[PDB]
């Protein structure tokens, strides 16, 4: 599908509200496997199970290992821009 830019708004007491799988060491992108109901990713409306997370806040995640992506993603605060694609 088309590459999309998606904005997510998160408070500091919350996580992103997604489960991710995959990563470079497995030869696949960082993939959203769950959107947890009522949490920030669900509320933002534009992120979905099956989306590959290509970048967050301009940080490329295409070639990132799983735990690298966890560190990068969990570091982001407030208004967070995602670049995603559903294949």
């Amino acid at each position: 599908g088309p590459i999309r830019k998606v904005l997510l708004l998160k408070e500091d007491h919350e996580g992103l509200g997604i489960s991710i799988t995959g990563g470079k060491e497995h030869g696949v992108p960082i993939l959203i496997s769950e959107i947890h109901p009522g949490q920030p990713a669900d509320r933002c409306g534009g992120l979905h199970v099956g989306d590959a997370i290509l970048a967050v806040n301009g940080v490329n995640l295409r070639d990132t290992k799983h735990k690298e992506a966890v560190t990068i993603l969990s570091q982001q605060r407030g208004e967070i821009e995602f670049e995603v694609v559903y294949v």
């Binding site: 996580g15 991710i20 799988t21 696949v28 496997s33 769950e34 947890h36 799983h66 735990k67 966890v70």
Partner: peptide
Amino acid sequence: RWPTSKI
């Protein structure tokens, strides 16, 4: 298989 993290 691949790991999953909740974030």
